[PDB]
Amino acid sequence: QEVEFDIPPQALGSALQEFGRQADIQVLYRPEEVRNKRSSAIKGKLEPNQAITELLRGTGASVDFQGNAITISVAEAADSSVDLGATMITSNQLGTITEDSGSYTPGTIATATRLVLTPRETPQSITVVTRQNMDDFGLNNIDDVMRHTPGITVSAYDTDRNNYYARGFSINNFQYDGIPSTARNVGYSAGNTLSDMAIYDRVEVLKGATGLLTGAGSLGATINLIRKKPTHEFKGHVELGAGSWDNYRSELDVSGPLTESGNVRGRAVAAYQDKHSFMDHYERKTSVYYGILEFDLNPDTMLTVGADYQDNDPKGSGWSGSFPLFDSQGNRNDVSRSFNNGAKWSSWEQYTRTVFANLEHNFANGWVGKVQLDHKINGYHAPLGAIMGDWPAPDNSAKIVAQKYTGETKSNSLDIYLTGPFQFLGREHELVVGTSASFSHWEGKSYWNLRNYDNTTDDFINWDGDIGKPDWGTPSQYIDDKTRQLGSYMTARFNVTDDLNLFLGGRVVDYRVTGLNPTIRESGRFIPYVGAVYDLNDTYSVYASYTDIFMPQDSWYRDSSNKLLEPDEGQNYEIGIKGEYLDGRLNTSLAYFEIHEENRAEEDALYNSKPTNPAITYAYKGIKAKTKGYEAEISGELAPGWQVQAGYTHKIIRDDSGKKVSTWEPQDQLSLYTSYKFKGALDKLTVGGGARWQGKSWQMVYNNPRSRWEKFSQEDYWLVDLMARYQITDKLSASVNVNNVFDKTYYTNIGFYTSASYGDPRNLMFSTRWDF
Ligand SMILES: CCCCCCCCOCCOCCOCCOCCOCCO
Ligand SMILES: CCCCCCCCOCCOCCOCCOCCOCCO
Numbered sequence: 042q043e044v045e046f047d048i049p050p051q052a053l054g055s056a057l058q059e060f061g062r063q064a065d066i067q068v069l070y071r072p073e074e075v076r077n078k079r080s081s082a083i084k085g086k087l088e089p090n091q092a093i094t095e096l097l098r099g100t101g102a103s104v105d106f107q108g109n110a111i112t113i114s115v116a117e118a119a120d121s122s123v124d125l126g127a128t129m130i131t132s133n134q135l136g137t138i139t140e141d142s143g144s145y146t147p148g149t150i151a152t153a154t155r156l157v158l159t160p161r162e163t164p165q166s167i168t169v170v171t172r173q174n175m176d177d178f179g180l181n182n183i184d185d186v187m188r189h190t191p192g193i194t195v196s197a198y199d200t201d202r203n204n205y206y207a208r209g210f211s212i213n214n215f216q217y218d219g220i221p222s223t224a225r226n227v228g229y230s231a232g233n234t235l236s237d238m239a240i241y242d243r244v245e246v247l248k249g250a251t252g253l254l255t256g257a258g259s260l261g262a263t264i265n266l267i268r269k270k271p272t273h274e275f276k277g278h279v280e281l282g283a284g285s286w287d288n289y290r291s292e293l294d295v296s297g298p299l300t301e302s303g304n305v306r307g308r309a310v311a312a313y314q315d316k317h318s319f320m321d322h323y324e325r326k327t328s329v330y331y332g333i334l335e336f337d338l339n340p341d342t343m344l345t346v347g348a349d350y351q352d353n354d355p356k357g358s359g360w361s362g363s364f365p366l367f368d369s370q371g372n373r374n375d376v377s378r379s380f381n382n383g384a385k386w387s388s389w390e391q392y393t394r395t396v397f398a399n400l401e402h403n404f405a406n407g408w409v410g411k412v413q414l415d416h417k418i419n420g421y422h423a424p425l426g427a428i429m430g431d432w433p434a435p436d437n438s439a440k441i442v443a444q445k446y447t448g449e450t451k452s453n454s455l456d457i458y459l460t461g462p463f464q465f466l467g468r469e470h471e472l473v474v475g476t477s478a479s480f481s482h483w484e485g486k487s488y489w490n491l492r493n494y495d496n497t498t499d500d501f502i503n504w505d506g507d508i509g510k511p512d513w514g515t516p517s518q519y520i521d522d523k524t525r526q527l528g529s530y531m532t533a534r535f536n537v538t539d540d541l542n543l544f545l546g547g548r549v550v551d552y553r554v555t556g557l558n559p560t561i562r563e564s565g566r567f568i569p570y571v572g573a574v575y576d577l578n579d580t581y582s583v584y585a586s587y588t589d590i591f592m593p594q595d596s597w598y599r600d601s602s603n604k605l606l607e608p609d610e611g612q613n614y615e616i617g618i619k620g621e622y623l624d625g626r627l628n629t630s631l632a633y634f635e636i637h638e639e640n641r642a643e644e645d646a647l648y649n650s651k652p653t654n655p656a657i658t659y660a661y662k663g664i665k666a667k668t669k670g671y672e673a674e675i676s677g678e679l680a681p682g683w684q685v686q687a688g689y690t691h692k693i694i695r696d697d698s699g700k701k702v703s704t705w706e707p708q709d710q711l712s713l714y715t716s717y718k719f720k721g722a723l724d725k726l727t728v729g730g731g732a733r734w735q736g737k738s739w740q741m742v743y744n745n746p747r748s749r750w751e752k753f754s755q756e757d758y759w760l761v762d763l764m765a766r767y768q769i770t771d772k773l774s775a776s777v778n779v780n781n782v783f784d785k786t787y788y789t790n791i792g793f794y795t796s797a798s799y800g801d802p803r804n805l806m807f808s809t810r811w812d813f
Contacts, residue, residue, distance in 0.1 A: 044274060045303055046092050048083045049340075054130070054407045056080035056096055057113060059340055061132025063303070067148065068132040069157075069647065071470045072407050072462035074115040075102075090656050107625055108142045110149065124539040125576050126470040128462055130407045131157035135218060135267055139171040139243045145686045145714075146628050146677035147171060152247045152265050153217060154532045154546065155254060155458060156568070161621045164544060164572035164584035166248040166672060168192065174686060175238050177716050177729055177764055179282070179778040179806050181290065181314070182327075183236045183266070186244050189690025191674055191712040193246070193262075194735070196705060197789040197798035199359040199427075200323055200381070201389040203234050204705040207248045208613075208636060209668040209694030210261025212250060213592075217395070218268050218452055220407040220415055221255050221479070223524055225554070226595065228483045229450045231421035232393040235353045239292050239312035240331040242267045244731050246674075250613035250636060252568035252590030256477070256528040257552050259592055260611035260636055268347070271306035271335050272296045275813075282808030284778075288316035290808070304337040319802050320381040323357035323505040341403040350394040357381055357506055358389035360427040360442060361536070362796025366753070367453040369434035371746035373652050378786060378799045384426035385506035392420045408461030415454040417481075422447050426508065429794070431746055433501030441496040441751045443511045448485025448520060454478065473546075476529045485520035488513035522556040532570060544572030544586070556597035563608060566591060581620045588613050592664075598642045603656040606663040607640040627677030636668040641696060666702060668694040682720060687713035705792065707757070709736040715762060729764035730782075740792035753791045760785055760800075772813070778806040 048059050053075035061068035066089060081098040093104050093111065105112045112129075136150025136157055147169035149157045160167055169430035170186050180186045187205045188195045193212075198206045205212040215222045215233050224230035238244075244266050251263040277295035282288075296308035312329040333347035360383075363374050397415045404410065426443035433439050458475025494511035498504065532546025547570055552563040591608040598606045617632035640663035648660040670692035679685055689711050696702045716729030736757045745753050762784040768774045781803045790798035 042274070043086050043088050044092070045086050046083045048080065048096060050080055050082045052405065053078040053080055053100055055341065055403065055405075058132050058403050060082045060093060060096060063273060064092070064341070065138070065274075066132075067107075067137045068113060068128045069110060069149070070113040071115070071127055071469070072130050075100075075113070075465075105624070106684070108137070108144060108148060109139070110137045122539050123579070124536065124541045125579070126162050126540075126574060128471045128534065128536050129157070130389045130462055133157070134401070134409065134411065134460070138270070138296070139169070139173065140269065142171065143173055144626070144677060145171055145684045146626070147243065147245070147472065150245060150624065152245050152263070154534070154544065155219070155252070155460065155475065156471060156532065156534055158226075158411070159621075160630070161582055161619045162542070162574060163585040164574050165588065165615065166192075166630065166632050166634070167245065168248065168674065168688070169243055169245045169676075172241075173684070174714065175241075175243075177727065177766070178714060178731065178762065179776075179808070181238055183244065183264070184234060185239070186238065187264075188730070188733070189712065189714060190246055191686065192248060192690040192710070194706045194710065195789070197362065198793055199361055199389070199798070200320065200363070201353070201355055201358045201391065202711070205264070206274065207246070207262035208260075209666070209692055209703045209706065210259055210632070212262045212264060213259035214255045214263040216255070216263060216265040218255070218413075219265060220413060220456055221526075222256070222417060222419075222480065223450070223452055223481045223526070225524060227421075227521065227604065228448065228522065229419060229421040229452075229481060229524070231450070232351060232353055232391040233419070235327070235351070235392070236266065236682050237312055237314075237327060237329045237351055237564060239294065239329055240269055240310050240349060242269050248805045249615065249634065250588045250590040250611050253530060253532065253546065253548050253570045253588065255590065256526050256548060256550050256568075257563075257592050258590055260590060260613070260638060266331065267329075268295070268349075269296075269310065270310060271308040271333060273298055273303055273306060278812045279812055280808060280810045282806055284316075284806035285804040286319055288314075288806070292315045293521050298509075299334070305332045305334060307332065319379060319804070320357070320363065320386055321379045323355065323381050323383065325353070325355040327354065328352045340566060342645055343401045345399045345401075346397070347395045348394070355388055355390065355393045357383040357385060358425060359383040360387075360425045360429065361794035362790050363798045364796060365428070365430065365432055366742060366791070366795050366797060367431050367744050367746060369431050371744055378802060380401045380504065381506065382428035382504065383506060384443070384508050384510070386424065386510045387426040387506070388422070388424055390422040392418075392422075394418045404461070405437050406461050408459065410459045411457070411588045413454070413456040415452070417452040417454070418449060419452075420449040424510075424513070426510070428498065428501070428504060431795075437501050437792065439498045439504070441498065441508055442495065443491060443494065445488035445513045447486065448483065450481055450483040452479060452481035465535070470533060471536045472531070472533045477527070479524075481524050483520060483522040485515040485519040487520070488515075489517045490514045500709065513532065520557070522554065522558075524554045525552070527551045528604070528724040540576035542574045544574075546570040552593050554593070554596075559605070561593050561596060561605065563593050566608075580622065581618055583616070583618050588615075594640070594642060598661050598663065599657055600619060600660050601645065601648055601654070603660075604655060606642060606661055609638070609640050609642065611636050611638045623678055627679070629675045631671075631673045633671045634668070636694075637738075638666040639663075641666045643696065664697040666694055666696040668692060673760065682718040683715070684717075685713065685715040687711075687715075705738050705740055707735040707738045710734065714762070725768040727764075727766045733760040733762075733765075734758075742792045742795055745795075755788045755791065758785050758787050759783070772811060774810050776808045776810070778807075782805050
């Protein structure tokens with residue numbers, strides 16, 4: 042619809058930039074094509090397609106509308122073959138917003154290198170869950186999203202923490218608007234598993250080995266959450282949802298200009314959810330607030346300030362799994378899916394809040410620079426009590442474990458980087474040079490010396506949670522950790538021929554963790570980055586990349602000699618093909634990949650059998666593991682009304698013993714989520730559904746009473762999802778989501794501290810949504 046423009050004539054670059062800004066649209070263009078040109082003045086209330094063609098009046102340029110992107114070109118009569126990946130400067134550094142695109146596929150993406158590239162142009166496996174996907178399938182938090190992310194497998198530690206694997210690894214890398222958080226363990230990372238989606242445009246997952254922009258981190262993948270932003274036109278909605286197990290949700294989201302001119306814009310979102318659950322006596326209130334304001338200091342310098350807040354507050358949290366595998370005498374337990382071994386009062390409450398500011402400046406080169414300041418808090422308040430151990434015993438009694446952990450981490454970050462194009466051998470390339478600093482400080486109390494507590498319960502079979510709460514006594518531990526990461530990085534993207542793009546870059550890292558443990562230093566470690574992308578057709582590209590990453594070990598991972606293991610390292614080797622269709626409206630990928638880990642922390646069993654250095658009591662051993670696997674995906678428009686996202690991933694990871702490892706992640710998985718928007722008589726109705734399939738998965742757990750190892754198997758199963766929406770009104774729609782249609786019962790955890798969690802049973806969600 043119509044928009045208030047005011048773009049004075051200037052360097053074509055500047056105007057395209059200024060237009061992008063004023064229209065809330067991504068504007069892509071070629072540096073060399075707009076260099077010795079200027080725009081015609083646009084002024085007043087207009088529609089963007091009118092506005093842009095008017096701005097380009099006399100420049101010899103054509104416009105290509107693509108969703109929330111417009112890509113600007115200046116055709117020649119000459120042309121001798123097309124440079125599909127030509128260096129393109131871009132108006133929004135985070136990428137193309139997906140909100141409103143109507144699509145399940147992303148537009149452009151800055152996750153891999155900090156350069157704005159399309160999935161076809163990025164030589165790494167990159168999956169994105171778009172704003173519409175989140176809406177259509179009711180994905181209200183990061184857990185929901187990960188469960189619909191192809192190639193991810195979500196598993197339960199306990200009712201209030203999940204594990205996300207990719208490619209053989211627990212994912213432990215989270216970003217916001219491209220800034221890494223600190224997640225060395227559950228100290229620094231309270232709430233990461235639980236972020237509400239009310240404040241996000243999309244989530245982007247870069248599978249592989251992501252050292253280049255994460256710095257120090259886990260192998261497997263990075264998860265990158267992109268915040269919602271303000272708009273120059275007014276808009277918002279209010280949403281109310283009601284689902285199984287007294288699950289209630291409400292949401293308000295407002296955005297728009299805040300001054301007659303347009304130079305200060307804001308966006309505000311509040312979301313409140315309160316849900317009981319299929320698990321007995323578990324409940325959880327979650328509260329979220331967010332505000333961002335933009336200010337234009339001048340047409341080419343913008344300042345952004347913002348804050349967000351989320352509180353996750355449960356009753357009946359478990360500590361490990363939902364129930365124990367074996368009873369006292371060694372038999373497997375059969376329990377209702379409702380069973381929950383948390384105490385009534387037991388709670389693993391987790392909170393997060395951020396204050397952040399940035400400054401973005403267009404330089405005249407079409408170079409642009411950016412300074413991000415972040416202050417992040419991750420806090421936890423955790424009085425846990427859960428039935429634990431080989432129980433029941435024969436007379437139906439059991440025993441509780443109770444411990445209390447409270448704490449906060451405070452983090453501060455500075456990220457500064459510069460991005461721009463440049464001529465080299467008569468061709469146009471681009472570069473990102475950046476540097477970053479973070480300091481975080483974890484601070485906690487632990488309680489475990491309980492005073493005069495009777496931790497037996499007289500009834501396993503009807504466990505209700507209804508046990509007393511212990512006197513926590515005085516703190517048993519003070520935690521005081523300081524981590525400090527400093528990084529510098531540079532990537533260059535050369536356009537070597539009309540169809541070869543070479544990527545060369547690296548990050549140099551310095552990592553100090555200081556505290557109550559022996560200091561852990563790592564200094565001037567080089568993380569390399571090499572990538573190539575060869576065009577074959579208008580449609581398909583091949584690509585390879587060698588990417589790297591390391592995480593210095595936790596301080597208790599020491600060895601025979603009580604020396605800290607070297608940093609857990611991994612390279613990912615990838616070759617693949619990517620295809621692109623309907624002018625970027627649909628993408629496909631088929632990738633082959635291999636990760637080589639080294640210094641993987643493993644037990645050291647022969648030492649452990651009988652420790653012989655009084656120094657260390659439980660040594661480890663830094664071994665080598667490999668992932669070998671392949672992956673296929675598709676996202677976007679199959680036909681006009683029809684969207685999909687779907688993937689297939691095969692994996693096996695083995696360590697030096699030769700044995701398989703991560704054997705709880707299935708070797709094979711498939712995802713397919715789709716919706717269809719009818720046309721004509723039924724054009725107000727979208728229908729969708731999805732299906733999630735995986736193969737055999739198992740664990741070795743030790744049955745302690747019978748003194749033997751047992752394999753535990755989850756046989757391959759399907760989960761099926763269904764979805765309907767109706768736009769009753771220009772401004773009001775209603776929606777139904779049914780999940781786990783065939784009420785499959787399966788396990789989300791078998792083996793974690795000898796326990797088991799169940800997957801969600803069939804559940805529905807009804808919601809309405811009201812757009813002002
Ligand atoms: C150090 C703290 C930083 C605070 C940052 C939080 C900012 C919160 O901003 C709240 C403002 O939100 C703006 C919502 O936009 C809607 C305004 O619409 C104008 C009303 O429309 C009437 C006529 O158009
Ligand atoms: C063990 C659980 C089994 C549950 C199975 C349920 C299967 C039936 O699902 C379909 C439900 O259809 C109900 C129709 O309701 C229509 C949605 O209306 C939304 C209300 O809009 C609000 C207006 O302000």
